[PDB]
């Protein structure tokens, strides 16, 4: 939640961060 948009990195696991 809150924020999802600012990424970094051309290769993450990570999609679904919601904390």
């Known amino acids: 939640k809150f ?3 600012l990424d970094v990195k ?3 696991p990570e ?3 919601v904390k």
Do not use: R
């Open 10 to 12: 051309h290769f993450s």
């Open 15 to 17: 999609d679904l961060t």
């Open 3 to 5: 924020v999802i948009f």
